[model samples]
Target: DSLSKSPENWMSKLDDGKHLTEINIPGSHDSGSFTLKDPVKSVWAKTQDKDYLTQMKSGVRFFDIRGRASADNMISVHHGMVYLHHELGKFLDDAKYYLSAYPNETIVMSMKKDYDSDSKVTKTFEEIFREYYYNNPQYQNLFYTGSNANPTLKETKGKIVLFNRMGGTYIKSGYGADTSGIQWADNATFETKINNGSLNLKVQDEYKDYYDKKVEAVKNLLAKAKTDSNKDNVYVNFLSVASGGSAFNSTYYYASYINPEIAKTIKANGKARTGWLIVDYAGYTWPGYDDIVSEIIDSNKL
Candidate 1:
């Protein structure tokens, strides 16, 4: 069943000794960007067509979330400045429910502050996230609380691993089990070490140019993720690229072109790791493309 189209439990086939760094994980770029009803905003900001649970069922294991905190302590989801009409709690509940049903799986989440010009907040982003996290004592154990940066798959099963991109305040004081350092540079290929050299990361997120350039950047990162074995590396190759001002340069355009190309590349490669391939419209049946998520999932040798 390695080639099955249904990929929901793909991670269940991975070995317990497999480190998170080495898995070929399928993920969504803006994990909560599907709430837009306005055609104007949907043309530019809507990245996902399905909700969180649908994406989970489609075998997405990583979530890229941009949020703005409010004075009321709620973290509302956004695709850039456009609010997606949902909050972080909704995503949390979905993840918790899915992980409970499929305990063999793990989800990696990156939470970062979106531009805050349109929102009002009375607390630091960290404070808001902590309030949401700590206040829910019932779901406390649903997160990976270990100190290790590159946890073995065994350690993260049925848990969410937080790649905290809020700030360095927690790292300066002390990293809780939920805290993982993120040294991110926007819309560029860059590298950073986190957990004090415990994990190395390479990211490609060039979203500000032609679709060809986005394809090139994605392919370059995929090559590194497949063959680069010199460190404890975790590569995030983003297939969701777009320009801000025009609908022609939106996620819909780029994902349409890029997803099929990358999917074909992975399908022809024959069991090579692709690290994390995060994209928009993750489960959509793009024409001429094998399921991108299923292609990545089949690369894992059980």
Candidate 2:
């Protein structure tokens, strides 16, 4: 249940000749935003109950982290609560551990600006990254700049591809939106009308007066992703929605409804693909959280 192996150890089991972007990755959205500031608002943001080590140990390979500087000028992880980036380095270190033990493993991270402050009281948006991470030995691993072509697992061993969701065309010695090596999904906050047997969920949705209605929206996206087996683009799907109506929005409901359904299809369909499946509240409340991931990992055999 916790401290699991390399995403079903898919990287180890699959062929080593494929590009990092070509394989299916199970990611945790708002990976570090689980703990909240207000108990009342936790529903709006808190996603995971476990911290970095636990989440990393629990089967999450890709991390979707939002960071902002505190009054002390140290970067902190945020969702609705502002907490220290407690074990970010260790999380990478764990990835290093997995990579060392397996050697054929690879991990991806999407870092973006989450500081709610409009002005940079601590440092400019770009200043802290360059100072704290950009060239720092502690930060550089096997980050994928736009320059590298499709790299195989062996080539990416002990490396974490840097997929910067941060702005700007370039990040010093790193990759930016303009050059995110592999194709990436834009906008961290995006959702579909919940229903519609439509793969059209990939695009952002402004109107949200609907429901997932049979979880077909999720199924459509996965089907579309399988078509691009060439590794030309990295398709990322976010399993998150908004909650503003008079009714409640349970974190477990989305995963319970969509995740298991997706898993069922992957098992039945045989050949499968989902460049990256990002989720929130990656816990049992979702019912089939583990099942969904297993199906994604099983895709390597396909």
Candidate 3:
């Protein structure tokens, strides 16, 4: 029930003119790359300061000096630099220079690109949202099945979307087996039933166990963080669960398991850690998973 029709609201912050600027370094080709001798020098000379240069080299490296023949080729890279410079400026609190660097034209063009890109993302998000809440009425109704049903009221807030069954059904076979179900069970007969089953059950049991193990793996990885200074850090983990129905089940199972574990690990380790779990549903689209992961990383999550 909690969804926003206003992707434009979110898009607006991204389009803030203060955040957008023009780079009228002249001849679109003067993107500071031609000024220096080598890649490092070019980056250093553009940013001016050595530390800034190092950061640009290490963190925001994407300009291709070799592939600048076509404006089409350079457009992508130029826009990318604009994006990074804005990001870096914001991070460093150098809003003045960030706003001053780019012209209004550059900002407008960037906004156009961003608006177009976000429109697509918003559409895709709406599709997924509808799939779970609007298109799947049966599943949607399950959100209100219980007296204490505390359904989330905002799109930014996370909610448990149980695919099948509802209520205090046995945690073993019911959709509530996942935390999305939110029903608690301890030393119950249903647990026993779940613990003991046949070959098909064995596969389901293994799937859950494997998924749980992956969650633990992420926990262990986070635990290795050495200092409190690392708190508020965000880490992205990409997982490829096999294919077909089993893959779908496995991906959701792991997501359900991992999401909570990440919160727990961060709380226990005393580090404010954030994690994005990107799962490739269909094996063939693994390349696209990288794009998805990058986008999630860039987004300001609520």
Task: Count clashes in each candidate, considering only residues at least 3 apart in sequence or on different chains.
Answer: 0, 4, 4
Tell me which of candidates 1 and 2 scores higher on lDDT. Answer: 1
Q: What lDDT is reached at residue 227 by model 2?
A: 74
Error of 2 at 99 (Å): 3.9
* Residue range 14-100, candidate 3, lDDT tens digits: 222221101000011112222223443233122211222322221111111111111211111122223222221122222122223
Q: Report lDDT (Cα) of residue 125, candidate 2.
A: 44
Per-residue C-alpha lDDT of model 2 across residues 4-28, encoded as one tens digit per residue: 2445355666677776667777777
Q: Candidate 3 regions off by >4 Å?
A: 1-209, 226-235, 243-248, 267-302
Worst 10 residues of 3 by lDDT: 19-28
Q: Between prediction 1 and prediction 3, which has the larger lDDT?
A: 1
Candidates' C-alpha lDDT? 0.78, 0.56, 0.24
Residues 229-265, candidate 1, lDDT per residue (tens digit)? Answer: 6438888888887646543566776788788888888
Scanning candidate 1 in windows of ten residues, the lowest lDDT window is 169-178
Highest-lDDT candidate: 1
* TM-score, structure 3 vs. true: 0.22
> What TM-score do all the candidates reach, one by one?
0.92, 0.76, 0.22
Error of 3 at 243 (Å): 5.4
lDDT of model 2 at position 301: 52
Ranking of all predicted structures according to lDDT, beginning with the best and ending with the worst: 1, 2, 3
